[PDB]
UniProtKB/Swiss-Prot annotation:
Effect on the protein upon substituting V118 to K/R: Strongly reduced CO(2) hydrase and p-nitrophenyl acetate esterase activities
Mutagenesis or variant effect for T195 to D/E: Strongly reduced activity, but enhanced zinc affinity
Outcome following mutation: H91 to C/D/E/N/Q: Strongly reduced CO(2) hydrase and p-nitrophenyl acetate esterase activities, impaired stability of zinc binding
Reaction equations catalysed: hydrogencarbonate + H(+) = CO2 + H2O; urea = cyanamide + H2O
Enzyme active site: H61
pH behavior: Optimum pH is 6-8.
Cofactor note: Zinc. Can also use cobalt(II) with lower efficiency, but not copper(II), nickel(II) and manganese(II).
Protein name, UniProt field: Carbonic anhydrase 2
Taxonomic lineage of the native organism: Eukaryota, Metazoa, Chordata, Craniata, Vertebrata
Annotated binding of substrate, by residue: T195, T196
Substitution effect: V139H: Impaired activity
Superkingdom, natural source: Eukaryota
Length: 257
């Protein structure tokens, strides 16, 4: 099945998921000079005060922190969005080295990692329905650079020892995703896709301009995770990022000049 290795990585995914060569694939390179400032865009509204995290899971590709999305507890609104999008999970993509790991790039620059906060449009009732709609999902993407520690990440880092291998889960309650947000909510936005199979073209991407900083020790802990299950040959979970895809007939819009 799909992964990030030599024989099953991003260049192979199109054989099982032909939409991999579609017209609105993600990630993309964000050319900051050709993105268009759009004054019709509203400020984002990030309402995470009542977020209820449940669990953390190693799914063999990344790790996901899952939320209770059965009520409007943590929602994204505004910006380019019409309606209310509920937080269902977040996860990261990261590199084997500090100079790679992000999915989106900015003027071809790669960051050490990228955080995806995944939200679905409540008009569609559940996540599985939402992914089948062109406006089903809103993903808030946040770059990570290596520098000072991010205190709000540490609880995640702490628990990774409990989910080293594929299929392991752990209780992960009372985590506050606000502690992963940078100061500014200035963003770029474009229509795109999931960055992993099934690569569905259901995402309004909102990529924040300002990265967060995490420490060398924090990223190193991500790199100790395993793609494999317990008792299978150890393969470190690193470089779990899809490279930039062609923009095709899309314009990236900026909320800021």
């Amino acid at each position: 099945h799909w992964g990030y290795g030599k024989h099953n990585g991003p260049e192979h995914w199109h054989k099982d998921f032909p939409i991999a060569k579609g017209e609105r694939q993600s990630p993309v390179d964000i050319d900051t000079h050709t993105a268009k400032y759009d004054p019709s865009l509203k400020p984002l509204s990030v309402s995470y005060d009542q977020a209820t995290s449940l669990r953390i899971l190693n799914n063999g590709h990344a790790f996901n922190v899952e939320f209770d999305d059965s009520q409007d507890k943590a929602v994204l609104k505004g910006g380019p969005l019409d309606g209310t999008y509920r937080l269902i999970q977040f996860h990261f993509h990261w590199g084997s080295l500090d100079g790679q790991g992000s999915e989106h790039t900015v003027d071809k620059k790669k960051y050490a990692a990228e955080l995806h906060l995944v939200h679905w449009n409540t008009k569609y009732g559940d996540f599985g329905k939402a992914v089948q709609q062109p406006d089903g999902l809103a993903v808030l993407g946040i770059f990570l650079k290596v520098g000072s520690a991010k205190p709000g990440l540490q609880k995640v880092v702490d628990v990774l020892d409990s989910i080293k291998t594929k299929g392991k889960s752990a209780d992960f309650t009372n985590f506050d995703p606000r502690g992963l947000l940078p100061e500014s909510l200035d963003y770029w936005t474009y229509p795109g896709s999931l960055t992993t199979p099934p690569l569905l073209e259901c995402v309004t991407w909102i990529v924040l301009k300002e990265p967060i900083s995490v420490s060398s020790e924090q990223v190193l802990k991500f790199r100790k995770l395993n793609f494999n299950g317990e008792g299978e040959p150890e393969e470190l979970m690193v470089d779990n990022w899809r490279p930039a895809q062609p923009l095709k007939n899309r314009q990236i819009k900026a909320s800021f000049k």
